[PDB]
Amino acid sequence: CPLMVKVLDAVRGSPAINVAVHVFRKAADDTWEPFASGKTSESGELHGLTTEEEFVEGIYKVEIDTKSYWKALGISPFHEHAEVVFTANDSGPRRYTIAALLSPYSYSTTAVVTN
Amino acid sequence: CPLMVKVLDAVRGSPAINVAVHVFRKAADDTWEPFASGKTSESGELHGLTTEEEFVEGIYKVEIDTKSYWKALGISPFHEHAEVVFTANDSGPRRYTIAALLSPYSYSTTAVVTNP
Amino acid sequence: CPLMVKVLDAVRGSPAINVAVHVFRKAADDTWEPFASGKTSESGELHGLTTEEEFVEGIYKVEIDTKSYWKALGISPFHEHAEVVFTANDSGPRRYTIAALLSPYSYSTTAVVTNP
Amino acid sequence: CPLMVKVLDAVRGSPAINVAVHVFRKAADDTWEPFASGKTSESGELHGLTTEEEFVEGIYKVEIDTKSYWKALGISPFHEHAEVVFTANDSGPRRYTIAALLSPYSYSTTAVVTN
Ligand SMILES: O=c1cc(-c2ccc(O)c(O)c2)oc2cc(O)cc(O)c12
Ligand SMILES: O=c1cc(-c2ccc(O)c(O)c2)oc2cc(O)cc(O)c12
Ligand code: NA
Ligand code: NA
């Protein structure tokens, strides 16, 4: 798998567990088509979203359902979700990790792309 | 103005100048309708997007065109754009500052919300 | 003033008010000498720490007392304090804004440096 | 080992490799005493700094030598180093990960503390 998502909680200092994550691929008509999805594990990670065969060059969106995460912890959040939009490029490293660090009124996201 | 956007460049330690910003509002049919747009000034700030009257309750998306910014400083960056999606004014009018801190493979965004 | 500190609270989406800040400057003997201190206002900003005359070249440390801040909002936080260490004015006078964004187990800091 | 350090590079979208990291423990006289050190690996991680026996409650400082990292990449940085200061507390989770995300004029740090 060439795509992994990792989510951390800056309030609790913990992995963000059981966060829903939806991946979309941009279609020729510019709409976002569902591509893969899952929930983060006890380590805050979501593995196995896709395969090398399927993750072709294109524009992808990773939506992390942060609002539901915070609400389940009883904490009032700002954002509806965190969205990460990027082009997959075959000239670069093979493995993409999309990481996000969550707070109620702020988030950070980073891409770690490696060979 | 009840909505301001501020953008900083974490490589240079400077305001991010001339960053295009597009704001959308979710319509009754669930589509993202264009709401306002502009670009950051020499201070990295974008003022005057909207008015108290116009910025009603709704779900808003602030799209910050980071790729176009970094396609100009010689950095092929990772992201297409930073998208900030939030419900606004659902407990009455508030003032929102949407801040973003940009690097070529990473960004942070925070909201500062105040009650006038 | 050539040195300003701004602090935001990522839990509340607000300025971080009444945050104590201590600035030190490395002395010739390598010790950290007290240089200036203050606390953030209702805007989350701390102005007036120093002057152009006083803020000479050197290595400075800005200590932001985050634990004491969060020991007041009911959050036992992780860090003791955020420390920001940098060489200043070594190419002539500059204006420095040291910004920090606080969560109980994490913080970000960025510098915005401008030439007057 | 109860203490791990992980460092990422936000400019290159990569682990931050070969970054020097120094850990200190606060002594009774308030000085910082060297405790452990190393360099990050090809994964941006530094493992094996200490042991459960040695990492007793106390105040620790992790200094990450960011200036030298950026200079080796030919990039002009702001900070001398990034400093992370915290109390180790035996009531909490056993394992501490100190993570840092580096840019030339900015850094983020997070603690992930787990059982
Ligand atoms: O979004 C961020 C916004 C700001 C910020 C900094 C100065 C301001 O006058 C302001 O209105 C916002 O500072 C940051 C500082 C950080 O270290 C990380 C961040 O994400 C931000
Ligand atoms: O996105 C972030 C991701 C990570 C991160 C932390 C541990 C990992 O094993 C990893 O693969 C990524 O650490 C951060 C640490 C930060 O201080 C700020 C961030 O945005 C991140
Ligand atoms: Na309402
Ligand atoms: Na000089």
Side-chain angles (χ1 to χ4, degrees), chain D residues 54-87:
Chain D
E54 299 165 292
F55 189 58
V56 297
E57 292 185 307
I59 301 178
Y60 294 85
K61 175 170 62 166
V62 176
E63 285 196 7
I64 304 170
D65 301 332
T66 58
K67 188 180 190 178
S68 296
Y69 176 75
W70 293 115
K71 289 163 64 182
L73 292 173
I75 291 167
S76 185
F78 180 74
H79 303 93
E80 290 295 302
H81 54 256
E83 193 158 336
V84 182
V85 183
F86 67 96
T87 299

Side-chain angles (χ1 to χ4, degrees), chain A residues 4 6 8 45 97-102 107-112, chain B residues 106-107, chain C residues 106-107, chain D residues 4 6 8 45 97 99-101 107-112:
Chain A
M4 192 267 279
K6 184 162 182 84
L8 296 177
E45 297 178 7
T97 296
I98 302 302
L101 175 63
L102 308 183
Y107 63 86
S108 182
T109 187
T110 309
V112 188
Chain B
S106 182
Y107 63 88
Chain C
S106 182
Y107 63 88
Chain D
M4 192 267 279
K6 184 162 182 84
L8 296 177
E45 297 178 7
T97 296
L101 175 63
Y107 63 86
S108 182
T109 187
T110 309
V112 188

